[PDB]
Amino acid sequence: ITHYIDAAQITIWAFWLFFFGLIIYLRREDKREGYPLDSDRTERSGGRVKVVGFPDLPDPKTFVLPHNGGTVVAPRVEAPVAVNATPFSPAPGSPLVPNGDPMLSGFGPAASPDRPKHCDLTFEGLPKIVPMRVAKEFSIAEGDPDPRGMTVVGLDGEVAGTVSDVWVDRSEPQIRYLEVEVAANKKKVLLPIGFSRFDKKARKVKVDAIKAAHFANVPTLSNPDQVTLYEEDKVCAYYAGGKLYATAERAGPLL
């Protein structure tokens, strides 16, 4: 006997039903941050219309933090935060332009959310990211130079200061920040390893993100022996603003 329907055809159709169900599941999970959307439709509706697209948002999940750190929920209602910028044009879809000195505006690649004002912790409950002054069990791996005492140069090759310490991850041993004693003001500021190139034979750290004089305004730590999530983002974002803001040419275009 012959039939057009066969088991291979049945099974492939069954797969499509599963797969489209899976995609809808995934798109819901994708909306646990950043939704509902900031639109001009919600503004004029007086907030009546929430823009969420399809599928709609999932019910909130809870993240229980260790060491009695509290509970995080997702999705969550997050308060609007003023933008320190003015639109270049009033038309929708236009960019904005930072107010004041761009490096210091907290806008564009200088921007960042306000992370929590407590430190990431080791499993045992100590501050995770700390200078080698504090975690004395750490050493420099034999074969590699000690960054302490190296001179830090900005994007234009001028001396910004000297490395005064190294900040390490106690959970997963690696350098996360260099501590820079800034020549101009004698403050000690963090420098993320992600923005640092070593010139080993010269014992120099090169920082392409900012000029030497920009080190004077790197955001400062409340406590010299630990760093909060909040301060980590403020530090890293300040260097990143330099990628677009630190010189005029960086605005573009090429042509």
Binding site: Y4, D6, A7, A8, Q9, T11, I12, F15, L22, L26, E29, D30, R32, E33, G34, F63, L65, V72, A111, S112, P113, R115, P116, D120, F123, M132, E137, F138, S139, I140, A141, E142, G143, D144, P145, P147, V166, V168, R170, E172, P173, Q174, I175, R176, P192, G194, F195, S196, R197, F198, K200, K206, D208, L229, E232, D233, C236, A237, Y239, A240
Partner: protein
């Protein structure tokens, strides 16, 4: 110029971590950890320690027996000549039993060793699955790894056990050998009328390509935000930072939508898992349900048609 965060320029050292303490009933870990400078250039310099209870000890014993039976038979097939074993290594193999034996345990001289290696490798893998399950349980972690491992085991089982049993013959299973298992792969497509026309083969390719697409995207995305600590995905997930915001906006502005730091790992999980689910289903249907995938595709209207520029008289017709 900028630091790309591909290689660690300056490593630091601390006393080796012995690991998160395990609950009562777990055995103490074994090994004195060492440090590799060159591994420390690309990743973690620490090697060891390792956990080894009953599950893993049994797994490793079964697995070494299986591997040794294969290597032994390869060397015997060049008459113990170690130099010819190195010459022909990629060609040598441990061969499935002849078709005359069906699914019966075949003689030691002609297929018994294949059947024993498949049995003992399979038990070794199943026990390794239990190991991945137990190691998550002892740390209080969920079982995502063992579920994905089970999907790969499903495909492996279909190749060497389920389909051969359904088809009535160990001779239809896979040989243990480098080039021999490539012969088997090509011959399987030939025998079943071109695996390109198997729709679960097409899906498995979409998901294998998609896995490389997604790890290239995600790997590169995270390194581009590692300057903001984006590689620390636990705290970016509980406490969204500018790493996670910039990652999502890069993709939203590029292609119109984006995921979250947690949910990209769900996309990645399913893409990889569906590679081997669809692969198992595709092989499971070959020979049992569909005997010629090209003709199955003709029947369901899928095969392209071309202007005829070559053609051959069938001498069986003449």
């Amino acid at each position: 110029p900028e630091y790309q965060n591909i290689f660690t320029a300056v490593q630091v050292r601390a006393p080796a971590y012995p690991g998160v303490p395990l609950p009562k009933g777990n055995l103490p870990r074994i090994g004195r950890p060492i440090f590799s400078y060159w591994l420390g250039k690309i990743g973690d310099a620490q090697i060891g320690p390792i956990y080894l209870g009953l599950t893993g000890t049994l797994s490793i014993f079964f697995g070494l027996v299986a591997i040794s039976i294969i290597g032994f038979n390869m060397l015997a097939s060049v008459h113990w000549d170690v130099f010819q074993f190195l010459k022909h290594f990629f060609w040598l193999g441990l061969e499935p039993p002849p078709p005359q034996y069906g699914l019966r345990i075949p003689p030691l001289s002609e297929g018994g060793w294949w059947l024993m290696a498949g049995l003992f490798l399979t038990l070794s893998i199943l026990l390794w699955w239990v190991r991945t399950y137990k190691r998550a349980e002892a740390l209080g972690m969920s079982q995502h790894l063992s579920w994905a491992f089970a999907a790969a085991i499903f495909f492996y089982l279909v190749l060497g056990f389920i389909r051969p049993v359904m088809m009535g013959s160990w001779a239809k299973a896979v040989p243990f050998g480098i080039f021999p298992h490539l012969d088997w792969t090509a011959a399987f497509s030939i025998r079943y009328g071109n695996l390109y026309y198997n729709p679960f083969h097409m899906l498995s390719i979409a998901f294998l390509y998609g896995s490389a697409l997604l790890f290239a995207m995600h790997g590169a995305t995270i390194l581009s935000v590692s300057r903001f600590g984006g590689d620390r995905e636990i705290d970016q997930i509980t406490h969204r930072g500018t790493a996670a915001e910039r990652a999502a906006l890069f993709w939203r502005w590029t292609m119109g939508f984006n995921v979250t730091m947690e949910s990209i790992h769900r996309w990645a999980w399913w893409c990889a898992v569906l590679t081997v689910i669809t692969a198992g289903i595709g092989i499971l249907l070959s020979g049992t349900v569909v005997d010629n995938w090209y003709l199955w595709a003709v029947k369901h209207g899928m095969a392209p048609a071309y202007p005829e520029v070559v053609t051959a008289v069938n001498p069986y017709e003449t």
